Paper text:
The enzyme consists of two distinct domains, active respectively as a phosphoribosyl-AMP cyclohydrolase (PRA-CH) and phosphoribosyl-ATP pyrophosphatase (PRA-PH). In this work, we obtained crystal structures of HISN2 enzyme from Medicago truncatula (MtHISN2) and described its architecture and interactions with AMP.
MtHISN2-AMP complex crystallized in the C2 space group but with different unit cell parameters and six protein chains (three dimers) in the ASU. In the MtHISN2-AMP complex, AMP molecules were found near MBSs in both domains, PRA-PH and PRA-CH. AMP bound in the PRA-PH domain formed hydrogen bonds through the phosphate moiety and the adenine ring. The adenine N1 atom interacted with the Arg263 guanidine group. We also observed the π-π stacking between the adenine ring and the Tyr240 side chain; the approximate inter-ring distance was 3.6 Å. The proposed orientation of the adenine ring of PR-ATP was rotated by ~ 180° in the ring’s plane to the AMP pose in the MtHISN2-AMP complex. This means that the binding of AMP to the PRA-PH domain in our MtHISN2 complex apparently shows the positioning of the N1-phosphoribosyl of PR-ATP and the plane of its adenine ring. We also observed edge-to-face interaction between the aromatic rings of the adenine and Trp107, with ≈ 3.5 Å distance and angle ω ≈ 45°. However, we did not observe a metal cation bound at MBS4 in the MtHISN2-AMP complex, suggesting that a metal bound to the MBS4 can either promote substrate binding or may not be physiologically relevant. Distances observed in the MtHISN2-AMP complex, Zn2+…H2O of 2.4 Å, Nδ of His143…H2O of 3.0, and H2O…C6 of 3.1 Å, are consistent with this mechanism.
Author numbering:
A (entry chain A): 48 to 157, 166 to 188, 194 to 264
B (entry chain B): 47 to 158, 166 to 187, 194 to 264
Amino acid sequence: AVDSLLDSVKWDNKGLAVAIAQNVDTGAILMQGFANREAVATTISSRKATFYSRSRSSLWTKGETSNNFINVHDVFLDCDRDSIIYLGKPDGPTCHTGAETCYYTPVFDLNKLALTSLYALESTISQRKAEVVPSWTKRLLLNDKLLCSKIREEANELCETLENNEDKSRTASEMADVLYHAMVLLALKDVKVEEVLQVLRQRF
Amino acid sequence: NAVDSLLDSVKWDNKGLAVAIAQNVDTGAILMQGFANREAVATTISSRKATFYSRSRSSLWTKGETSNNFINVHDVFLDCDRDSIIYLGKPDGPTCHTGAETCYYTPVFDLLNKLALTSLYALESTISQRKAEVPSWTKRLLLNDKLLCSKIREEANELCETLENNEDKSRTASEMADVLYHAMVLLALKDVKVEEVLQVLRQRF
Ligand SMILES: Nc1ncnc2c1ncn2[C@@H]1O[C@H](COP(=O)(O)O)[C@@H](O)[C@H]1O
Ligand SMILES: Nc1ncnc2c1ncn2[C@@H]1O[C@H](COP(=O)(O)O)[C@@H](O)[C@H]1O
Ligand SMILES: Nc1ncnc2c1ncn2[C@@H]1O[C@H](COP(=O)(O)O)[C@@H](O)[C@H]1O
Ligand SMILES: [Mg+2]
Ligand SMILES: [Zn+2]
Ligand SMILES: [Zn+2]
Ligand SMILES: [Zn+2]
Ligand SMILES: [Zn+2]
Ligand SMILES: [Zn+2]
Ligand SMILES: [Zn+2]
């Protein structure tokens, strides 16, 4: 059944397809390599992301020496079946330099990681926490009583958009209000958003 | 120029291409993966529209040039070895030519059609299925506004108590998940996508 599936992949002249490893919990692109028929099959059977190293001319499972495996949860093919997503959860940092992902060379800021909207805000909140030990985040990080009251009150306002039939944009605006203040509490308690999303996934 | 010096450091392959991945700036969903040469990257930067090189037609191709479903690029990233590119952008419409939101919807373990979703947006999709099928806790919350809102306020209370009562970080993590779930049932009631919420956060930068 695996044989019938690998035959459908559109490989290039070298027998390769693009294989992208993505964090199953956050969506961050960890790394992008290449896979041949055997590299994808090994990923399927071993549940650890495996690629074809063109340089070393051999199969390569991420973590085989460093133990920073990418435990693969699902594999996706795009429409033309020439691109692959390894959707996995990494044991440690993915890049061989030690960086969390391989993408940290911004072209517009001309070393910061590539972050989507939710994880960039978490990163900003983290920077305020470091400069703590005039900012609204620093004010919340330095006042537990104010932060907790703000979370309770904003949660109240989110519900009032449902209870009082406010516009959908009002609900989104208040959900953002809840999300920001909760992440300031997350930072105080040393909790990453990824850990929270892992909890959600474990409750499936 | 500074961009020219940046394109010069890019390690292009023998035919002058590099892998280009389009990713949703707000959610992280991978929209599509193509290939870019210097001019596809340079034009992507200048026009702020994701532009690739169509190898089959052997010409430049801007995603959306016919369908108007452009990918409006917010950032461009190079990986460590500088042979892989991420166009980080916000798409006008569905990216795949079939109409799918993204191009990646062929699960391999289900073959041994669902979109590839990460945890937060998979929970959003599940809550959405419960809303349409309306013995499940989500359907019950969708059928009782007073109960749903009571649970949100109660769970937001519990999250604060983990800070107030010096509870363990695992307790904070567990309670934050509780707040997130019940909030997303309220989002589904008000027809709010998580992406819409994250756009608001991004707009408050
Ligand atoms: N994310 C990565 N992308 C490309 N090459 C890598 C990556 N991580 C490690 N390597 C290299 O691949 C080999 C396997 O290392 P590792 O899988 O990290 O134990 C070593 O030569 C590493 O330097
Ligand atoms: N208290 C909770 N915290 C987080 N996720 C939850 C919770 N209750 C239900 N879920 C999620 O909702 C899904 C469907 O639940 P149900 O509507 O009871 O079938 C589960 O598989 C979980 O992912
Ligand atoms: N009231 C707020 N609601 C939502 N996001 C906020 C709020 N205040 C600050 N932020 C976020 O926190 C970042 C840093 O704010 P500050 O710590 O006040 O400099 C902003 O760029 C926003 O992304
Ligand atoms: Mg109000
Ligand atoms: Zn393709
Ligand atoms: Zn790397
Ligand atoms: Zn508010
Ligand atoms: Zn690379
Ligand atoms: Zn497509
Ligand atoms: Zn709880």
